[PDB]
Symmetry: D3
Subunit: 126 residues, 6 copies
């Protein structure tokens, strides 16, 4: 994909990180496949949870949200790419790799990273 | 959907309007359904067209691009909402209505608009 | 595909051209992929429009109708073939090419045609 | 659906019955859902079978072909309607009912018929 | 797929054969594709049929049930594999081959079998 | 669903728990929707991981595996039911609820459980 489009994806993930409500870290994620956004996600508590403030074991990471949206989508996550504001944790990394995510782009930085690479997911900081 | 999420959608459509190459008008569109972005689009020439500069009868409107992406998606466009930077032309309006697009949000302004309403699509400027 | 099947497709597009209500031109279209019809379409006004008579800027071309049906389908339009009674206009041509339509078959005849070819869509009159 | 559209469906099933190669009976079927054809089928031997002539236990009924195409489609057969040139046999009837086919339209005539009705599928001769 | 997984599939088909109500033969089937079960099925009468006891011409074979479930699924049956407790009859065989079923595994044993092979479906007893 | 079918689901989840390689706990999960299994899963390391032995932070829970398979499926996880051999952990619970899983059935037993209930997922031990 051309350079300026790559950046538009990352900035979108950034747009969505700011929707989140966590004071510790705001994270956004975007799934892209075949020239199309398929899912977005940010970090926080599940829809219909009581407390909005996050750190709480029941808040989902941005990548978890995107992934769950893909599970309710009709479109496969396999072969897609993940644009995230942050490098993913080890728990998101396992799932991303098993999901057939081709590559992860992150803006902000580390175990998650080397495991993704071990497992054949490509990684690029931008 | 909460107010600040509505705005994040419009700003995303704006992010994508700026990817376009037309000097007359830069337009972005975003399809949203069930809390998820499903397609994006901007105005310009078809992939693999020779001249990048647009006005040329062969440039697609942002809404046409989003729509075509929905046609290659596995996910239905019916019941979704369109966030566009601009009010749509009459040609996009016909298709949006026939596609079962529930509502169109636009930032920038007019026949397209009243026809969408005639045809039962909701409209809101934001 | 065998010759007589090709013809059955064109005759079906013809069956549907005659459902239309336009006095100027009756057009039918049929999307085929992997041995299966996926969509059909004819020219006319959008469902729930007041006047049935078409020429009016709010009537959709047969190809626009088929395309919109594909957008509400779960099945991708990419790699399919279009059987139309008529050569498509430039506006339908842009969309057909961007949709990944592999080839267009038409019965009745011209800018749309050369652009489709420029853009890598195959074309055959039958 | 309007009357003349109903007829266009039946005539399409008829277009496809004539593609078949069986000397005993030529049958066509068409699946329709939400204003769109999703599958077609006719009676005959499986793709890549040696003898084209049918009666042979290895020829599929038109309804079996349509059904198998639906199984390879991404679009559900549930809630669709079947237009067939002929009333279906008991073996097709079982499957049609279990498939959630809403209604069957046939042109030409009888156990299959009453079972479809027992099982809550609607039936109409046209 | 590893050996012990193959067996887990067959045992699942066996789990489901025992749900059936036929005194003559209890059959189970399982569709597998890309490491995932997509459908299951057993032999018996259609949902909402009056008599539960089967032999009756209106009972579906396990393979017919799985196939019908695939037709109501969004996921294609093409390229999948069938695990059945029994070798399939000729009527199921025609459909399995036309469905693009890659291979059939059966536990219990014969025309269906050679036709599947004629038609390019692989077969293995286990 | 009838009682004996409920049990066949749980026994299938059990069939798959035994495929796993973890010495601490073997877990199986099964997704069911509209009378059809859509996904299965067990606990362990990601495909292509080096060490098969699990406890390791890079092993996925059975529910995580099923969920990831749903993300690569064309079929939505929303409105489905989860049969698991075990009550789910808090991390699986968040995701299950956000996924629109209607109800979870487990065989073996506790925070995950009350949160699922807080969040409107039904729960039943069997
Ligand atoms: Cl999915
Ligand atoms: Cl589509
Ligand atoms: Cl679509
Ligand atoms: Cl299917
Ligand atoms: Cl289907
Ligand atoms: Cl999915
Ligand atoms: Zn994480
Ligand atoms: Zn426009
Ligand atoms: Zn046109
Ligand atoms: Zn029949
Ligand atoms: Zn059989
Ligand atoms: Zn867990």
């Amino acid at each position: 994909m051309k350079p300026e489009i790559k950046e538009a994806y990352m900035k979108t993930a950034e747009l969505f990180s700011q929707v989140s409500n966590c004071k510790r870290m705001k994270v956004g994620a975007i799934v892209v496949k075949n020239g199309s956004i398929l899912a977005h996600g940010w970090n926080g508590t599940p829809s219909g949870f009581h407390t909005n403030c996050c750190t709480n074991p029941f808040v989902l990471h941005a990548e978890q949200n995107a992934l769950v949206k893909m599970a309710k989508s009709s479109e496969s996550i396999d072969g897609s790419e993940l644009f995230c504001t942050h490098s993913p944790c080890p728990d998101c990394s396992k799932m991303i790799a098993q999901a057939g995510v081709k590559k992860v782009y992150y803006r902000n930085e580390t175990d998650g990273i080397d495991v993704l690479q071990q497992l054949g997911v490509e990684v690029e900081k931008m």
